[PDB]
Amino acid sequence: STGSATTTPIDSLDDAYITPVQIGTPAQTLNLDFDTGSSDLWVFSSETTASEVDGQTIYTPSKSTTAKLLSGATWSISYGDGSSSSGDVYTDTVSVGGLTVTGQAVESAKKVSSSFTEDSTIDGLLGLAFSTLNTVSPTQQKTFFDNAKASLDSPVFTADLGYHAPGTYNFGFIDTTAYTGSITYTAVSTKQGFWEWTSTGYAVGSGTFKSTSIDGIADTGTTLLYLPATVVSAYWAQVSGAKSSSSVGGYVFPCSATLPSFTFGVGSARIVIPGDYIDFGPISTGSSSCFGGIQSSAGIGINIFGDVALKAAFVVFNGATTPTLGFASK
Ligand SMILES: NC[C@H](O)c1ccc(O)c(O)c1
């Protein structure tokens, strides 16, 4: 089997991407944030505290003939950005882009934190990291991908995120028309439950490539590119007037600037992030200070190749017995 679904930016900055997902019978379509940095499929629901729902589409398990309470199971998750959600669990039929999994754990939110409530465009998350991170207790549950894997033509999914445009998540096949040149594969460590890999270095603009190992995670659920402070300082030093602002919470730059590109290494290959991808616009409406798309990972504890990096590439998440990651230009 295979599946193919379009993913669409939630706003003009590409802050996140939503992908329609069919849950239950008859189908209830919710727009979920596919997150390769976590491993829970959770949704706004008829069980979510009413004051914490503001515009989201909800899953109502009582209206699904295939929903079954997973008795005694609860979940609770806290994300890197400080947001959180928790609740109980149903199993139900879940389909993405024509690919159907029966008996998928659908985690129904009883509580969500304010950042989820305040974002009316995201109806929940669909985790695509390794199932070892799944938070369901006392019986840990599998991700949608892990459940689908055996049925897939090939044990892979691909992320093809657009810059200010829709893109695609494919399951079970590699669309050889979706990228240019060849795909370069690189080793993955699953020790922390992430798609963790080591970049071979970077360049700023037309500058020389610096060969240096940068361990980080491929994370579709993180907006920005978070890298060591040395790397990030080298980038922003090439933008007149750029500075790190403790009050704003990262590097800002004059909105009048033209940003240089940023290149990262994948083995001997190179992925170029155009400067425009690094512009996250005014820090507040009407401001002439703009927020940068490359930020320091110091304090996070891990480097994160988030959407800023990933949308410059066609990315293969290879879930074979020994997982690997592939990157191609596009
Ligand atoms: N891993 C969680 C992911 O980074 C995320 C998605 C949507 C959010 O509103 C959020 O705060 C965090």
Q: Which of 33, 35, 40, 307 is catalytic?
A: 35
Q: Which of 39, 64, 199, 297 is catalytic?
A: 199
Closest C-alpha residue for ligand 1 atom 3: 221
Which amino acid appears at position 206 of this protein?
A: S
Helices (H), the chain: 114-117, 144-148, 229-236, 307-310
Listing DSSP states for 17-76 in one string gives: EEEEEEETTTTEEEEEEEETT---EEE-BTTS-GGG-SS---B-GGG-TT-EEEEEEEEE
3-state secondary structure of 191: coil
Distance separating the N- and C-terminal Cα atoms of the chain = 25
Closest C-alpha residue for ligand 1 atom 5: 221
Our answer to whether residue 35 is catalytic in this structure is yes
From the CB of residue 19, how many other CB atoms can be counted at a distance below 10 Å? Answer: 21
Report how far residue 195's alpha carbon sits from residue 146's, in angstroms, rounded to the nearest whole number.
14
Residue 325 and residue 186 in contact, taking contact as beta carbons nearer than 8 Å: yes
Name the nearest CA neighbour of 127 among 208, 41, 248, 43: 41
Our answer to whether residue 240 is catalytic in this structure is no
Distance of CA 206 from the midpoint of ligand 1 (Å): 33
Judge if 5-174 and 175-330 fold alike in CATH terms: yes
Closest C-alpha residue for ligand 1 atom 11: 83
Strand pairing category for 99-112 and 262-266: unpaired
Report how far residue 320's alpha carbon sits from residue 318's, in angstroms, rounded to the nearest whole number.
6
Does CATH place domain 175-330 in 2.40.70.10? yes
From the CB of residue 233, how many other CB atoms can be counted at a distance below 10 Å? Answer: 14
Question: Where exactly are the structural domains of the chain?
Answer: 5-174, 175-330
Give the resolution in Å. Answer: 1.0
Ligand 1 pocket check: which of 36, 77, 115 to mutate, most ligand atoms within 8 Å of Cβ? 115
From the CB of residue 235, how many other CB atoms can be counted at a distance below 10 Å? Answer: 26
Q: Which residues line ligand 1 (CB under 6 A)?
A: 16, 33, 35, 37-38, 79, 81, 83, 115-116, 119, 122, 221-222
Report how far residue 127's alpha carbon sits from residue 8's, in angstroms, rounded to the nearest whole number.
17
Report how far residue 188's alpha carbon sits from residue 89's, in angstroms, rounded to the nearest whole number.
30
Report how far residue 22's alpha carbon sits from residue 315's, in angstroms, rounded to the nearest whole number.
24
Which two tokens mark 7? 């993913």
Distance of CA 11 from the midpoint of ligand 1 (Å): 15
Ligand 1 pocket check: which of 79, 192, 295, 305 to mutate, most ligand atoms within 8 Å of Cβ? 79
CATH match for 5-174 among 3.40.120.10, 2.40.70.10, 2.60.40.10, 2.130.10.10: 2.40.70.10
